[PDB]
Amino acid sequence: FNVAHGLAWSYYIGYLRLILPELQARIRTYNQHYNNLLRGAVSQRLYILLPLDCGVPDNLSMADPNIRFLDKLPQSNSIYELLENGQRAGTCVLEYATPLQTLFAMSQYSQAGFSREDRLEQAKLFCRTLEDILADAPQNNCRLIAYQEFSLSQEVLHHLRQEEKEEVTV
Amino acid sequence: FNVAHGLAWSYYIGYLRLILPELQARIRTYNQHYNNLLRGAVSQRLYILLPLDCGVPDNLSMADPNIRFLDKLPQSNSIYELLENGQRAGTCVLEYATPLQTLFAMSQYSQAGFSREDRLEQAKLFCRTLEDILADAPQNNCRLIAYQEFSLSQEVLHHLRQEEKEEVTV
Ligand SMILES: CS(=O)(=O)c1ccc(C(=O)Nc2c(C(=O)O)oc3ccc(Cl)cc23)cc1
Ligand SMILES: CS(=O)(=O)c1ccc(C(=O)Nc2c(C(=O)O)oc3ccc(Cl)cc23)cc1
């Protein structure tokens, strides 16, 4: 009995599969304006945060004050700026894997018998299953950032700078 | 690997658990008006259709023309009238188990390797898991109507008349 299997398939089938095909076109359109205004570029991939403690807050800034909402990507998703010593070090479309909230709610529902360690195992299994799904899916369109709570903004920036290095080298 | 386990838990945790506690109060409020206007009563339970073929249409009437949308239950869900030879034989809050659509989408996604028989097994497992969950959940608030495609309206009416007989006998 592994709820993560169905949660991952549901998340992909009913959300990621629908959002990812148009994502890059939407970001290219946004970046024509963003490059004109700020001489930079929003990253092209959807970054999905997978906190293995299943703690999804209302506002990303609550998890790290160097992660601040910047703007809405039209047609919607949220663009966040990533700060270093008060400077914009990076920009990306960032959001939590919402099925993790189901795992958290289950661990607080006493009739489930779903312990805290159960939640952790299932959150790990959720990450591995989603990676397997995305690996075969019609991409290079999104990145899973799984972490056990360290700076979350620094971990995102790690990925954003690696994405740019891949962009310009291959 | 059984996607139905996580689909059922997700459906309960993120939807049924939220809707069921207030349902009866909402229907009692509606029925004060409905009894005044039509001298009858809407049934008190949420009826969840579980077509084992995972065929969830846009309009319930497409599945059976004796099932017609009647009105919105405020605060929302849809109230349907059940017809027999053109007469209102019953009234209830009726809706499909939407996770079944995830099963259907998976069977049409060739990289899943999720065959038609896989879909059937998982849809059955989804019904049994949901029943187990509801059995322990804090109720008598909803009824699962699983069926393999016969009149769907007659099957719903079967349940509605059994509910009323239970209401007046115990
Ligand atoms: C149909 S689409 O391809 O998904 C699509 C995707 C992105 C955008 C978009 O960024 N618009 C922007 C508008 C506007 O629209 O007035 O003003 C802007 C000012 C600054 C920036 Cl940085 C962007 C915009 C528009 C359409
Ligand atoms: C806050 S609540 O308990 O969820 C709640 C639940 C149900 C209703 C409700 O049926 N209203 C109705 C109103 C109105 O509201 O004007 O007119 C009506 C005419 C006919 C019927 Cl048959 C019902 C209503 C209202 C509140």
CSV table of N, CA and C and ligand atoms in Angstrom, one decimal, chain B residues 22-23 25-35 37-38 42 71-75 79, ligand 2:
chain,number,residue,atom,x,y,z
B,22,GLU,N,-20.7,19.2,6.4
B,22,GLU,CA,-21.8,20.2,6.3
B,22,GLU,C,-22.9,19.7,5.4
B,23,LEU,N,-22.8,18.6,4.8
B,23,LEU,CA,-23.7,18.2,3.7
B,23,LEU,C,-25.2,18.2,4.2
B,25,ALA,N,-26.6,19.5,6.9
B,25,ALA,CA,-27.1,20.8,7.2
B,25,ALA,C,-27.6,21.5,6.0
B,26,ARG,N,-26.8,21.5,4.9
B,26,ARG,CA,-27.1,22.2,3.7
B,26,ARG,C,-28.4,21.6,3.1
B,27,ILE,N,-28.5,20.3,3.1
B,27,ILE,CA,-29.7,19.7,2.5
B,27,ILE,C,-30.9,19.9,3.4
B,28,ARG,N,-30.8,19.9,4.7
B,28,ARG,CA,-31.9,20.3,5.6
B,28,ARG,C,-32.4,21.7,5.3
B,29,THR,N,-31.5,22.6,5.1
B,29,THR,CA,-31.9,24.0,4.7
B,29,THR,C,-32.6,24.0,3.4
B,30,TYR,N,-32.0,23.3,2.4
B,30,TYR,CA,-32.7,23.3,1.1
B,30,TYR,C,-34.1,22.7,1.2
B,31,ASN,N,-34.2,21.6,2.0
B,31,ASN,CA,-35.5,20.9,2.0
B,31,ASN,C,-36.6,21.7,2.7
B,32,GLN,N,-36.3,22.7,3.6
B,32,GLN,CA,-37.3,23.5,4.1
B,32,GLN,C,-38.0,24.3,3.0
B,33,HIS,N,-37.2,24.7,2.0
B,33,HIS,CA,-37.9,25.3,0.8
B,33,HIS,C,-38.5,24.3,-0.1
B,34,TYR,N,-37.8,23.2,-0.4
B,34,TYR,CA,-38.2,22.2,-1.3
B,34,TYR,C,-39.5,21.5,-0.9
B,35,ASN,N,-39.6,21.2,0.4
B,35,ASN,CA,-40.9,20.7,1.0
B,35,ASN,C,-42.0,21.7,0.9
B,37,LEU,N,-42.3,24.0,-1.5
B,37,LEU,CA,-42.7,24.2,-2.9
B,37,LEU,C,-43.3,22.9,-3.5
B,38,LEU,N,-42.7,21.8,-3.3
B,38,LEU,CA,-43.0,20.6,-4.0
B,38,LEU,C,-43.5,19.4,-3.1
B,42,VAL,N,-35.4,16.3,-0.9
B,42,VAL,CA,-34.2,15.8,-1.4
B,42,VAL,C,-33.6,14.8,-0.5
B,71,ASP,N,-31.1,21.5,-9.9
B,71,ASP,CA,-30.8,22.7,-9.2
B,71,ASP,C,-29.5,22.6,-8.4
B,72,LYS,N,-29.0,23.8,-8.0
B,72,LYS,CA,-27.7,23.8,-7.3
B,72,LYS,C,-28.0,23.8,-5.8
B,73,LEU,N,-27.3,23.0,-5.1
B,73,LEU,CA,-27.3,23.1,-3.6
B,73,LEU,C,-26.4,24.1,-3.1
B,74,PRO,N,-26.8,25.2,-2.6
B,74,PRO,CA,-25.9,26.3,-2.2
B,74,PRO,C,-24.9,26.0,-1.2
B,75,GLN,N,-23.9,26.8,-1.1
B,75,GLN,CA,-22.8,26.8,-0.1
B,75,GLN,C,-21.9,25.6,-0.3
B,79,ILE,N,-28.0,19.1,-7.7
B,79,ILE,CA,-29.1,18.3,-7.4
B,79,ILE,C,-29.7,17.8,-8.7
C,2,LIG,C1,-25.9,28.5,4.1
C,2,LIG,S1,-26.6,26.9,3.7
C,2,LIG,O1,-27.0,26.1,4.9
C,2,LIG,O2,-25.6,25.9,3.1
C,2,LIG,C2,-27.9,27.0,2.5
C,2,LIG,C3,-28.4,25.8,1.9
C,2,LIG,C4,-29.5,25.9,1.0
C,2,LIG,C5,-30.1,27.1,0.8
C,2,LIG,C6,-31.2,27.2,-0.2
C,2,LIG,O3,-31.7,26.2,-0.6
C,2,LIG,N1,-31.7,28.5,-0.6
C,2,LIG,C7,-32.9,28.8,-1.4
C,2,LIG,C8,-33.2,30.2,-1.8
C,2,LIG,C9,-32.3,31.4,-1.4
C,2,LIG,O4,-31.3,31.2,-0.7
C,2,LIG,O5,-32.7,32.5,-1.6
C,2,LIG,O6,-34.2,30.2,-2.5
C,2,LIG,C10,-34.7,28.9,-2.7
C,2,LIG,C11,-35.8,28.5,-3.4
C,2,LIG,C12,-36.1,27.2,-3.5
C,2,LIG,C13,-35.3,26.2,-2.8
C,2,LIG,CL1,-35.7,24.5,-2.9
C,2,LIG,C14,-34.2,26.7,-2.1
C,2,LIG,C15,-33.9,28.0,-2.0
C,2,LIG,C16,-29.6,28.2,1.4
C,2,LIG,C17,-28.5,28.2,2.3
